[PDB]
Amino acid sequence: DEDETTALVCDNGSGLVKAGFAGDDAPRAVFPSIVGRPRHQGVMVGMGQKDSYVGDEAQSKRGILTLKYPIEHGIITNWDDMEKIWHHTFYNELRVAPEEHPTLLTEAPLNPKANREKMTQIMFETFNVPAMYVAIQAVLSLYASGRTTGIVLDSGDGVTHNVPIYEGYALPHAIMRLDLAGRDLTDYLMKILTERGYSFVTTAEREIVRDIKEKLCYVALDFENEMATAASSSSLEKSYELPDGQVITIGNERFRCPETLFQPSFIGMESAGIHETTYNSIMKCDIDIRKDLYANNVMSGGTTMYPGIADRMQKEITALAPSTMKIKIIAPPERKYSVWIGGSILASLSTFQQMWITKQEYDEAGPSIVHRKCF
Amino acid sequence: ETTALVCDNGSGLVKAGFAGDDAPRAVFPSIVGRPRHQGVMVGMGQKDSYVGDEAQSKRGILTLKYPIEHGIITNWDDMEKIWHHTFYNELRVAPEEHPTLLTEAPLNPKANREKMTQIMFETFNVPAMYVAIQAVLSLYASGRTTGIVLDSGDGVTHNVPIYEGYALPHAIMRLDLAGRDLTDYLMKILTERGYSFVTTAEREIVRDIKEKLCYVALDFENEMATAASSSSLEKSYELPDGQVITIGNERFRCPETLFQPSFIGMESAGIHETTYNSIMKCDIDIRKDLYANNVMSGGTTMYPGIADRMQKEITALAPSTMKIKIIAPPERKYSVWIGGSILASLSTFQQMWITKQEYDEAGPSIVHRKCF
Amino acid sequence: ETTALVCDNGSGLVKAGFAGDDAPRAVFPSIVGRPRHQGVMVGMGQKDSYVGDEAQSKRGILTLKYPIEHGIITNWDDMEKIWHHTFYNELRVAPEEHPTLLTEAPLNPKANREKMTQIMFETFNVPAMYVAIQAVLSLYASGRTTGIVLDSGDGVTHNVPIYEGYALPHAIMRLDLAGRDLTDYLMKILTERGYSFVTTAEREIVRDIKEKLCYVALDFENEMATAASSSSLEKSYELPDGQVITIGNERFRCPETLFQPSFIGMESAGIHETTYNSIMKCDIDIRKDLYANNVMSGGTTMYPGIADRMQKEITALAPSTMKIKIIAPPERKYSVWIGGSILASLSTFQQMWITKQEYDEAGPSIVHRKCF
Amino acid sequence: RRVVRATEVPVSWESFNNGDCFILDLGNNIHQWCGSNSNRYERLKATQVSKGIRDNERSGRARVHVSEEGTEPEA
């Protein structure tokens, strides 16, 4: 079997942070990665008025705060706020000292190098962990499914990337990355809600539009027939309740928002959809391995949690591929946390103990050890 | 009395002009642009298809498509748009008066030759036409009749041996990476410095960065060591949004994909040993001058230091009992056009034209018996 | 009590099994693969060297090297890997119990024989060993004691005259083209249809196209005429990506390189008249039987119509006062193994083994005096 | 759960349960059937046993198929 360990897995994704222990089946702390700062005059002295709020309490008091995401499309921008986020997830959520626990972290492919040196520098100098490893999210998602052969479409809040892996060997020349994910879908939904007269400008309103996107939007099987159905009748309209008591209704905007994933020309990008990105990701691989990669399409991330996206994906890949091929798409119900589940697997494997970047290796080699060890 | 035209249809850079000139009159990239947003300001010169350098000017509001890919014509209506834009807008001539010379890649399929014949005779109504090869005009521009030609343009790279002024079809080989794949690899290896380029509009900017700041390292590992240790080779570029990028060790790593295709995951051979693989396939008697005449042509031979690195790499794995020299003229990016302009302007070329009435009672099959 | 092993080490297809059997137990290609990308799925049984049909299965993500080239052992460590995969993985037996019979190419250098003896006796610790020749064992497979053998496998083509059950070393001749060069020729003549195969991974796909769809034309020029005029012989093939290619005149042009070597440029003779050249080098009085036993062997004799074309080409240029027949059994691609199985199972073969203790007080030199 | 093992079971639909994983061996075709309630470690063990029984017993002369509920092939 696999030996025990005291490692931590902390998926530091763009919208959410999922932190927990290696070997467990579910991450212990799931909370959105925001830092809130007050934009109003505090006239009541006392009662612990903090200068900054982090985590779920920043979601609780979001009306009187401006909220900032330090991660923007995978790249960490504000290191102080994201350092405050790791301090909150080490000390307040898990309630563990990082000095006697190795830490596994996640990162999208084709990020800049300086993210990896700065991540190494704040993990080794500030918290003083004894070990570190950083891994690709889609590799971890393919660890979650239990397969080895397949293409993983991992789509978080900032990054949507296609990674094909045949057997154990990834193909780095076929790695596709597109900056089209839940942030841009939320912003496009905020744009098209003005067609019914509902205005949303602030960051708490952006959180409310994120909630309505999670709760009502769905992927249509065919866009023009669904548009004709929505124009002809009124059965597709559904209602939603604001926290102040106002009630809104939405019709075609349920399915116009995720259609940006399949047609990015709505938000002005001439890059093609995720189905053609998957298709030419398969086509950039050499000729012998297309057969297995068609039948093992794996989706992961919260952005793949729309209903009906698998049928539209099956129809578009079945249209693009030749007709003799069988195309199978794997959409497990636990695909939101699959990056963390594969992280718990990879931290729990017995082979992995001779790939930890130790303290003395960092001390002898600088922050540049991580590019020679990880990936 | 009339003047012939030379039109070298490159895969990403088309050249055109009049015969008997020392330089091509128009050099412009072979693209077709189409608009991607709605034109709300009507009656102000909006077109449904921008073609040529005009599409390169307003490339931000367009999507670009290359009609020729990998040296082979694929989209034909866009190629008709390219020929119309050469004849009417660039050269500003009527096609009915002037004969036209065309160049094609080696090992061109016959159907493409017939289709170029059919649209050149029917649509534009030319009086004369002829089709030649890139590599033979490159060798004629060098003033030689026997030698190896490495034509590395934007789509494909070709190694063509030529003996007694004719190619050897058994030993011509096509290695399919060129400046498009170098541009895509530089697009890959600028992400780690935080600079993001994704769409086809900024691909031309990465091509300009590749043209202005690249060089072939004579030895790779000590160059990487000096790039890692010092900062004497790190240099800046000014993007047209005003932001200034800086590039260090990626200046020389991107030319090295020609010598190492495994950088882009291609399992095929590097550029130095495929010429060796071509030259063993030739006959044993004719190698002695064939090693001596190393003709380089194409725009991707314009890197500084590619000739000395090529000399080192051939001299390493060839036997040491013979002398290797490589020639590289400064005009080698236009040498196909120079060979065509010498060939069209001769006193023996008027009988080699394919006239209109010869096309009439033979159809598009007389090109199979006259351009050989 | 124990059973002997027969292991025919082909240049691109190695056969193995137990003595006394009517077919070899394992047929698999002699290919050693090495990975070309980095393994990010750690701990999941990733290997630094994939060998055999396992390398053929995951052939996209590997670079493939042949340890035997042209019937001669060159890379010895990979050849030991072929032996380790053959004994331990394929046959699933320990070499310490079973005697082993090997096959060698004709006119093998003696140092290769000594090293085959040394890695059989030291590394695997066999109790008995013997080496034998491909062509005479094919003649014993034909049930004859006198005849010519055209053994044309994947590396070379051998023409061996045998009289009174022994070869005649002045008259064995070698012609260096076989199905590997036919695969490279078919790789060349699919480029005109627009299909590109450039790396070693898809070379077996082209080999499968050659195996499934090829035939020998009895007459070539009329077959050109019917292929150019009609399209009755054009057939489709299904690539494992799902693209469907279509093959016309290239189905039968690929066998014709054997009869016309100038299709791929070397100046040597075709397969039909080199047998005439070999049989003129023999003595006169033997030739009355020596023409009559035309033993065909090797996997490149599997083409339909090779026997009728062989009969026609021999009957054209031999004198007309003598009858010619061509024999081709259906099991001639395995005939070397069938000969090894019958020779290893004899009642007189126990004294011809080279035992371990005979190797100990003689070293690696006793193989010359006993395998003779 | 931790010490995952394989056991030969007779070929019938009644032997199947949703909580474990199954490997159907039919010569040149090897089918991997995963339960809906099956966990991570026996899925990894099923994949490892599948690649082992392809590449060692059959030496790569097989094709490994992975399937779950509702996507059972015709074999």
Ligand SMILES: Nc1ncnc2c1ncn2[C@@H]1O[C@H](COP(=O)(O)OP(=O)(O)OP(=O)(O)O)[C@@H](O)[C@H]1O
């Ligand atoms: N100084 C330079 N350094 C590097 N690359 C250059 C330079 N000048 C031009 N190029 C590249 O050369 C290519 C075009 O050269 P050229 O005009 O010889 O090709 P072409 O005729 O279009 O191609 P092909 O022969 O494949 O049809 C482009 O990729 C361009 O970026």
Ligand SMILES: Nc1ncnc2c1ncn2[C@@H]1O[C@H](COP(=O)(O)OP(=O)(O)OP(=O)(O)O)[C@@H](O)[C@H]1O
């Ligand atoms: N049906 C077929 N049609 C065409 N070619 C075939 C066919 N079957 C096998 N071959 C070819 O025959 C060759 C293998 O034959 P064989 O096993 O006799 O060779 P070998 O023993 O490896 O070679 P060598 O005698 O040079 O050592 C390969 O080139 C293979 O492509």
Ligand SMILES: Nc1ncnc2c1ncn2[C@@H]1O[C@H](COP(=O)(O)OP(=O)(O)O)[C@@H](O)[C@H]1O
């Ligand atoms: N049920 C749902 N329907 C649609 N979108 C969802 C759903 N659940 C989560 N999402 C989207 O997934 C994004 C975050 O997904 P996840 O990958 O789990 O976090 P991260 O992107 O931080 O790694 C959010 O932006 C949210 O919009």
Ligand SMILES: [Ca+2]
């Ligand atoms: Ca994520």
Ligand SMILES: [Ca+2]
């Ligand atoms: Ca050119």
Ligand SMILES: [Ca+2]
């Ligand atoms: Ca053989």
Ligand SMILES: [Ca+2]
């Ligand atoms: Ca169970």
